[PDB]
Design a protein around this ligand. Structure first.
Ligand code: NAP
Ligand code: NAP
Lengths: 287, 293
């Protein structure tokens, strides 16, 4: 089986290693071609140009910095007739739309998008899940090949859905990390032990697994009443900022304060955090 | 309360949590004296055997043990203003506030001659108060904690975290930081999903695993922070680009964007040459500088 990979960054090299381990004949291209150095002894062929790399195989795996770079790399690649593109470059839903439209206008058989939900060092383990979006029949053709990078989950036939879902999941993760950095800064500056604190904290974050579905149900049915009030949540954030200032510690969660303050001004002070969702869906604003 | 001879307890504050505390103390058999600015919120406790005191001073005179649960530590100070004498009184403050607000209140009651001050951080909502699964952190003199343990079992399970009165507030604010970030992320995720036409409940099924995962990831990061091991983990540069992807996903959908303070501190990290470090490397950027991000 002939497979081409475009991009040999930390994730690209991890993908290259997984595909070699799968037993495929691998053709690779990278802007910095010397990053293929470790793949040549495994039997990988180095293509001079994107165009050449694409010519070598009917299945093209892409893992570059961003979808802007993907479009620039595909720029001169004019002939994709017969080619299946597997794009594992993270980006936005509409970025995936523009790339899928570009390759399909140039002949591509299909486009499927993958969001890898792990780091390079765990790629290829069954516990490592990649969300896949695009035509079912294209997923089914590529499922065996894709197993080389871990567990695939077909989320939708719409190519833009892996990026939509992965961006949603990264919001949650980003939120968790913002609160956690703030917590550890406070605990550290107070002379407390970060590991002991995690022993106390990590359990209560476990708990959220239970509460996040409840909040999600309330949001769908637009039931914004029921649960700790937004006024209470905003006071909490004011105690966090001042607990921090007392210790000379800086504070995150500014956007959360700003949106909750405006909610109170709009008279939603007595609603639960479910009532913050329409604050976002209704207005294009960076809080 | 195990004795047929029911002890006298005073309660200052009858908001949602104060009224939950009242019902816990009445249900445990206490002889309860209450005060509230809005006196009529006591009305539901009177047919249960609660006495309503005219003033905070009268309330404090009625019991050797005073439980306080008010809006904030400033209202606590305002309410103790005309209380002259706390001789032989134990003060149990369940009002949320900062570490130094607890210090400032602990000096108000000490100056009045209070026997002791302990602080409690209730880690649940009023409806779950009194279930043994409901945990309150207590900080203050371990001997005062020990004496008040049976009385405190009325509101559920207590955990003595420290002899320092400021610690319950320190730890609770640190815990509320984590929860605030979780909720900020969740509201952003739900807004993107909703605006795209996807099913919030279906998404919760997909995403509830990831938050459970953080049972493991968080103690890993804590360890890294304590050893100042900032290298190892997905780098801040990749974190920052995921935030730019999130901002632009939201913009495509006409949806607003939270996580600004995170975007700002991670950008500065990059400028300062810490782009290759994990999230652990952001902790020293907070501890080094009194700034709002
Ligand atoms: N933990 C992770 O790393 C992780 C996890 C999940 C998904 N991903 C995603 O996987 C993708 C790649 O990640 P990575 O960690 O491999 O990033 P990386 O190590 O920075 O690699 C960047 C890749 O993009 C190429 N590149 C950058 N600018 C270019 C340009 N102007 N023209 C041509 N090529 C260019 C690089 O080529 P050079 O080698 O010549 O610089 C390299 O192949 C990203 O979308 C990322 O979001 C990463
Ligand atoms: N989920 C929760 O509700 C929860 C969970 C854990 C901890 N807590 C903590 O418990 C405390 C009270 O919360 P809550 O839910 O009871 O709030 P609440 O329902 O708003 O109760 C506020 C209380 O403070 C009193 N108050 C406000 N301003 C005052 C003033 N200027 N002078 C005198 N009294 C004043 C109110 O008097 P009136 O009745 O006359 O208005 C009422 O007794 C807070 O520190 C909170 O963080 C709450």
């Amino acid at each position: 089986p002939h497979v081409s990979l475009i991009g040999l960054g930390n994730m690209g090299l991890a993908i290259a290693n997984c595909l070699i381990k799968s037993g495929c004949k691998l053709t690779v291209w990278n802007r910095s071609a010397e990053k293929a150095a470790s793949l040549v002894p495994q039997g990988a062929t180095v293509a001079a140009t994107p165009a050449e790399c694409v010519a070598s195989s009917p299945t093209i795996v892409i893992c570059l910095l961003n979808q802007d770079v993907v479009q620039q790399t595909l720029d001169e690649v004019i002939d994709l007739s017969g080619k299946t593109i597997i794009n594992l470059t993270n980006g936005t839903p509409q970025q995936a739309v523009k790339v899928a439209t570009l390759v399909q206008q140039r002949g591509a058989e299909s486009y499927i998008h993958g969001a890898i939900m792990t780091t390079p060092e765990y790629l290829g383990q069954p516990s490592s899940v990649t969300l896949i979006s695009g035509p079912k029949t294209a997923y089914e053709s590529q499922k065996e090949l894709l197993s080389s990078i871990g567990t695939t989950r077909h989320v939708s036939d719409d190519i833009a859905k892996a990026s939509l879902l992965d961006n949603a999941l990264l919001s949650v993760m980003s939120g968790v990390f913002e609160g956690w950095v703030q917590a550890l800064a406070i605990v550290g500056a107070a002379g407390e032990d970060e590991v002991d604190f995690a022993a106390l904290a990590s359990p209560l974050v476990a708990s959220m697994a239970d509460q996040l579905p409840v909040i999600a149900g309330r949001v769908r049915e637009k039931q914004y009443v029921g649960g700790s009030p937004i006024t209470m949540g905003l006071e909490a954030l004011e105690n966090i900022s001042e607990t921090s200032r007392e210790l000379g510690v800086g504070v995150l969660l500014g956007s959360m304060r700003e949106v909750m303050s405006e909610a109170v001004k709009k008279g939603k002070g007595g609603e639960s955090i479910a009532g913050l969702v329409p604050m976002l869906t209704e207005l294009d604003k960076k809080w």
